């Protein structure tokens, strides 16, 4: 499923991020932007052989199991595959994790690199939240 920018906002919103780790609405919604173009089924191979999946691109070294990323773990306890779901509660449920993981969302490079310090709030200006 490809998101509507304030659809995602919604969902993330329902699903308890708005200000988890004290981390605002908006930083979520500009980190799955550039992590996955909003798309549920986004994948992408990393250099070390994991991959990320999903809305915010979560890999596969700790988080999920897909079978071929040897010397990873799963601390999600999740397949990958339930990272590229319509219903992104697997996604929020281990990006609880993660960020909860000691970095922040720094966990996520292209947040850091493209949504850290920028103002995040417009990505969910408009919305009906
Ligand atoms: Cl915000
Ligand atoms: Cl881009
Ligand atoms: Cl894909
Ligand atoms: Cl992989
Ligand atoms: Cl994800
Ligand atoms: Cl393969
Ligand atoms: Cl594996
Ligand atoms: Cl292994
Ligand atoms: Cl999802
Ligand atoms: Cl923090
Ligand atoms: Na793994």
Redesign the pocket.
């Known amino acids: 499923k490809v998101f509507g920018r304030c659809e995602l906002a919604a969902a993330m919103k329902r699903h308890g991020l708005d200000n988890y780790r004290g981390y605002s609405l908006g930083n979520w919604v500009c980190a799955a932007?550039?992590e996955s173009?909003f798309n549920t089924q986004a994948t992408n191979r990393n250099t070390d052989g994991s991959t990320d999946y999903g809305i915010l691109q979560i890999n596969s070294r700790w988080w999920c199991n897909d079978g071929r990323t040897p010397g990873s773990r799963n601390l999600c306890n999740i397949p990958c595959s339930a990272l590229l779901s319509s219903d992104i509660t697997a996604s929020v449920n281990c990006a609880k994790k993660i960020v909860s993981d000691g970095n922040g969302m720094n966990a996520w490079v292209a947040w850091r690199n493209?949504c850290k310090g920028t103002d995040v709030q417009a990505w969910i200006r408009g919305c009906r939240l």
């Open positions: 932007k550039f173009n493209r």
